[PDB]
Write a protein that binds this ligand. Structure first.
Ligand SMILES: C[C@H](N)c1ccc(OCC2CC2)c(F)c1
Ligand SMILES: [Mn+2]
Ligand SMILES: [Mn+2]
Lengths: 137, 137
């Protein structure tokens, strides 16, 4: 039986800027670094950055919607978004759905998100206003 | 301040086979479907499957090392891996370079993993068998 997400691994083209982005800009804790990767944590999340020469710096129009959302409190959301904006971090989408969301890109074009709200919150909103074809289980 | 992973969203090319893979084959809990997506959970993980016409079925040699690992106990690991193998689930990696792991592909080629152990356990193992150049903070 699967019990949760064990780790997220992102392939990166250049280890130093990726470590700077996740550790210094985003505030994640750096636990270890080696010649070809790093381990960070963000709350319960175990993040691995893996140096990979196959990683392309990928414009957002050229990647699909796969993306990784980090939790933040509503109270902290706006100042963290403003931090990313000051740093010149690119946005790939505007929010049009429930709960605050900020859609931003990492140095290699990985699609990230800041989101406020849980699955329970989303399901409650969907029960009240179901998407087209929505069925609950 | 970021606090963990709020959700993982995977772009999928065909919604129904992907729902079946995550729910029936991997045993995740299905909460809702709609014409363009589904919401599942795996322990505390919120997984969204998002139907995306841009998603390509991608062989593992054409994608980078970005991957998603799910936690499983030592007691359940081998039989779950063997069941995926017997069901014909494609793989993408064989060498255990990060401990007890099984590397397998979803229907669109998303790179998945079963892994036994926490970040703390991995760091302890790495102290004895470190990756080249490893430093611990
Ligand atoms: C489109 C088709 N008529 C259909 C089949 C099964 C469904 O629900 C069960 C499956 C697991 C989500 C559904 F909601 C719609
Ligand atoms: Mn999202
Ligand atoms: Mn892994």
């Amino acid at each position: 039986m699967l019990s949760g997400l064990n780790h997220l691994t992102l392939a990166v083209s250049q280890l130093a800027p990726s470590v700077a982005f996740y550790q210094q800009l985003l505030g994640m804790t750096l636990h270890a670094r080696w010649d070809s990767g790093a381990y960070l944590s963000c709350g319960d999340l175990w993040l691995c950055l893996s140096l990979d020469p196959q990683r392309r710096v990928t414009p957002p129009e050229e990647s699909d919607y796969t993306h990784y959302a980090f939790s933040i409190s509503e109270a902290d959301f706006a100042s963290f978004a403003a931090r990313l904006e000051a740093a010149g971090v690119a946005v790939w989408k505007l929010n049009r759905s429930e709960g605050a969301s900020h859609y931003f890109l990492d140095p290699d074009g990985h699609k990230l998100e800041l989101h406020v709200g849980s699955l329970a919150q989303r399901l409650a909103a969907c029960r009240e206003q179901p998407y087209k074809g929505m069925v609950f289980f």
